[PDB]
Amino acid sequence: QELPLARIKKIMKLDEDVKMISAEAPVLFAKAAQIFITELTLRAWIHTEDNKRRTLQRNDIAMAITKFDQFDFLIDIVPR
């Protein structure tokens, strides 16, 4: 689909506690990942527009992570 379900399954099985997966789980994650990509990109773009820029930069994504509690789990993934 828009995101490959087979690749989502592989990310799921990085966890030792996962080795058989249900039919709906990778499908749920496909839509969730699309919504998440959209949410994070949108939040970083708001900082881009506030600074009247037209190129979304990694700096902006790191910024959006700091300003929303929903993205707390991403604090050590993109550092400053």
């Binding site: 828009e2 995101l3 490959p4 690749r7 989502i8 592989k10 990310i11 799921m12 990085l14 966890d15 506690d17 996962v18 058989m20 997966i21 249900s22 709906e24 789980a25 499908v27 749920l28 994650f29 839509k31 969730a32 990942a33 699309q34 919504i35 998440f36 990509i37 959209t38 994070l40 990109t41 949108l42 970083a44 773009w45 881009t48 037209r54 190129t55 979304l56 930069q57 990694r58 902006d60 994504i61 790191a62 992570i65 509690d69 929903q70 707390d72 789990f73 991403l74 993934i77 993109v78």
Partner: protein, 89 residues
């Protein structure tokens, strides 16, 4: 392979649909989001596998995903996610 990621092109196009057509995205920025998405999936997975494993079940199901979403702060995602499942059923 520990760490695996969705293809950069799939991630990039979803990003492009989430901003005006006049916007541009830096290479690092897409790769950054590509990494975050894998982290997001592993994050949610690790809670669901616990909830699942604790009902001595062997497979993560829809409920465990949406249950993990609400627990970890993504409760706003649960409302559309249920809509998505309806159409394919």
């Amino acid at each position: 392979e520990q760490d695996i990621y969705l293809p950069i092109a799939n991630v990039a196009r979803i990003m492009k649909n989430a901003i005006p057509q006049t916007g541009k995205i830096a290479k690092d920025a897409k790769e950054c989001v590509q990494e975050c998405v894998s982290e997001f999936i592993s994050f949610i997975t690790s809670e669901a596998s616990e909830r699942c494993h604790q009902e001595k079940r062997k497979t993560i199901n829809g409920e465990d995903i949406l249950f993990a979403m609400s627990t970890l702060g993504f409760d706003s995602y649960v409302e559309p996610l249920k809509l998505y499942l309806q159409k394919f059923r």
